[PDB]
Each structure stands twice: as structure tokens, then as C-alpha cells.
Amino acid sequence: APVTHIWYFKGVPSRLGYLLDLAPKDLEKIIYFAAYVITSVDEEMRHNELSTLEAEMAVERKAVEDQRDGELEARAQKLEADLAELEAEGAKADARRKVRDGGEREMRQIRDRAQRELDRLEDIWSTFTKLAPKQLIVDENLYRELVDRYGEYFTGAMGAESIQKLIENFDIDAEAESLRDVIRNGKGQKKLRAL
């Protein structure tokens, strides 16, 4: 398994970091296997299906919401039905307030559980849409969910050999002049890091 020369990685300024415009701390989480790194993406194939991929993701987002508003309804039914059942028993009205706040606690949880799913489903679609070389996906379960769904659309790897891949598909001549353009611009702090 390929392995990176520590002289070029940990020596500051981090030569590898500068080369790939990768962060010194982000480089770490990669080489030593703490965070996956996107290696290459078929942007075209993404585009030519982006319309259909959106609709599909959408249907899941709807079907998640639909259960939520349904699940919530049935609890609201039984919340009102129980409050009256303890009323037919003639319980103290204060003893019903316990049952009241109980329901409102259960419904909140339900909504939050669903909402977390929808936020995850959001964080998934957002991430896939805006995917590109040199992106770090530190969250694992996302990346697993990211491969399972759209694994045909990009190339994700991890560790010292992924960084090997990044160097192969590195265009020196291109990345060079690109730095010279930021140099031609007066903007100091960004000219600093481009110098």
C-alpha cells in the first residue's frame, strides 16, 4: 500500500498541502485514514441525469413528510381521545394536564425524528449536488449513504493512495497559471497564499 514521505507532509510549510491546495489539517485526516477524500467525478453523467435524480430524491422527501403528518395526526387523535377518556372517568382536570403535556411531548419528538431524517436527506442531496475533487467527507455514514446512492457518479478513496491519485490527475501547467492570475490581481491576503 503506497505511503507518503513524512518529510514533505509534516515539514512546514506542508509541501503536499500547498501542491494540491489541501489544508494541513485536512491532509492529516486523509493520509492517516480519518476522512475520505473525493478523487474524481463524472460531472457530465451527473448532469445528464440530474433532472431524474432530483425527482427521485424528492419522492423520498415527500414520502418521509407524508408519514410524519400522518403519524402526527393519529397521535393527535389519541391525545384528544385519551383526555376525554380520563374525563369520562372523572379524573381531576390537573391530572389530565399531565396527559396533555405528555402528548405534546410525544408529538414534538416525532416531528424532530422526521425532521432529522429530512435534514439528513437534505445534507445528502446538497453534498452530492456540490461534489468535486479535493473535497473531504469526514462524516462516514454520509459517505456510505453517498456511495450507496450515487456511487456510479464519482470516485472516492481514502488514505495515502487516494492522495497518490490526486497527484496523478494533477495538471501542473494548468494549476500554475491559475496561481499567476491570482497574483496579477492586487488582492493581498490571497496573493500571499498564491505567492
Binding site: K29, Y32, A34, A35, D112, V138, D139
Partner: protein
């Protein structure tokens, strides 16, 4: 009881990876859940099916002839589901190794190297496991890892 703060706080810590190469491996193991006695049996059942579909096709490739597209595909899936089960059991009792790998610390060989070789014995352990005897996996493992 469960605040939104904690729920955000928990994912923040868990997501960040520590600097200690030892700790970072521990945290990885704690993900998969320990196995129920009958859960262990299940995987054993699958691996047996999985391990066997493989031995079928192995000698067949040498002799030549092969299964139809319907049989081979159905045969092939067991071979995958099996090789997937095996990987699950290993990840389950991956704690077990590190349990009795701490005990050989400070003996002229590193902790991690101890745990690895440890896992290396665990891989052989799950292969020759048998669920016919009602013994949990943990006992036929320990003797193999040690």
C-alpha cells in the same frame, strides 16, 4: 430529558477524530454492536451457506462446465451474502481481540501490532467456527486469538 444541545453536541465529538492512533482505532470498533447469542448463530448459518457456494464453483471452474444464468446468479448471491456475513462477525467480536491484547503489552512488541496479529487470529477463528455445538462464538474465539 434529551436536549437538542446534547443531540448536536454528541455528533460534534463523535465526528472529530483524535490524534492518538490507538484511540482512533478504538473509536472505530465501538460503532458495531455486540452480538446476541442467536444473532451469532444466524451469521454462522449464512457463512456456512456462503462458504459452501464458493467451494462448489471453485472445483467447477477447473473442470470446466458452469451453471445456467439463473442458477449461477442465485448461487453467486449466497457467495456474496456469505462473504458479507463473515465480515460482519469479524467487526462484531473485534472488541474481543483488543480485550486480550492489552495483556501482552510491554513485552517487546507494540500494542497495535498485538491487536493486528490478534485480529489475524480472529479471521481464522470465524472460518472454522461451527454452530452445531451450542457454544457461543466468544469461547472458540479466545483460544484462537491467544
Amino acid at each position: 430529558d434529551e436536549s437538542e444541545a446534547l443531540r448536536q453536541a454528541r455528533k460534534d465529538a463523535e465526528l472529530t477524530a483524535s490524534a492518538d492512533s490507538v484511540r482512533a482505532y478504538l473509536k472505530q470498533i465501538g460503532k458495531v454492536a455486540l452480538l446476541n447469542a442467536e444473532e451469532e448463530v444466524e451469521l454462522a448459518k449464512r457463512i456456512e451457506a456462503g462458504l459452501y457456494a464458493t467451494q462448489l464453483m471453485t472445483e467447477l471452474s477447473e473442470r470446466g462446465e458452469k451453471l445456467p444464468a439463473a442458477q449461477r446468479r442465485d448461487m453467486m448471491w449466497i457467495c456474496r451474502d456469505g462473504d458479507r456475513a463473515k465480515n460482519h462477525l469479524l467487526e462484531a467480536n473485534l472488541r474481543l481481540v483488543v480485550s486480550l491484547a492489552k495483556r501482552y503489552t510491554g513485552r517487546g512488541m507494540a500494542f497495535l501490532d498485538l491487536i493486528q496479529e490478534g485480529n489475524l487470529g480472529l479471521i481464522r477463528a470465524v472460518e472454522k467456527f461451527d454452530y452445531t455445538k451450542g457454544y457461543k462464538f466468544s469461547t472458540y474465539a479466545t483460544w484462537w486469538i491467544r
